[PDB]
């Protein structure tokens, strides 16, 4: 039901399995635990919020998805890697 995503700085993010399958890369992985040696906390947290935001508002007026310009490049790289 839930999967555990681990960041490079050792944070664990417990997300619903169905939400995490928004990522094509993660969907290719799947135990209940995926390790990311290259994605830091402040990026992986946003990635997780994206999963939920997408599942909820896909086929919904859609509110903005907030991204600080300071995290955007790292987020871009992460999202590319994650295929989402």
């Amino acid at each position: 039901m839930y999967v555990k995503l681990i960041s490079s700085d050792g944070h664990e993010f417990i997300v619903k399995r169905e939400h995490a399958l928004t990522s094509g890369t993660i969907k290719a992985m799947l135990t209940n635990e995926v390790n990311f040696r290259e994605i830091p906390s402040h990026v992986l947290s946003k990635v997780c919020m994206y999963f939920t935001y997408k599942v909820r508002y896909t086929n919904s007026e859609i509110p903005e998805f907030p991204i600080a310009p300071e995290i955007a490049l790292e987020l871009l790289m992460a999202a590319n890697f994650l295929d989402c």
């Binding site: 994206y50 086929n59 919904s60 007026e61 991204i67 955007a72 999202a79």
Partner: peptide, 16 residues
């Protein structure tokens, strides 16, 4: 209504 891919959203955030 369709949610943009995170790659697109992240790039749009670099444009701003």
């Amino acid at each position: 209504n369709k949610v943009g891919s995170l790659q697109y959203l992240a790039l749009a955030a670099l444009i701003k």
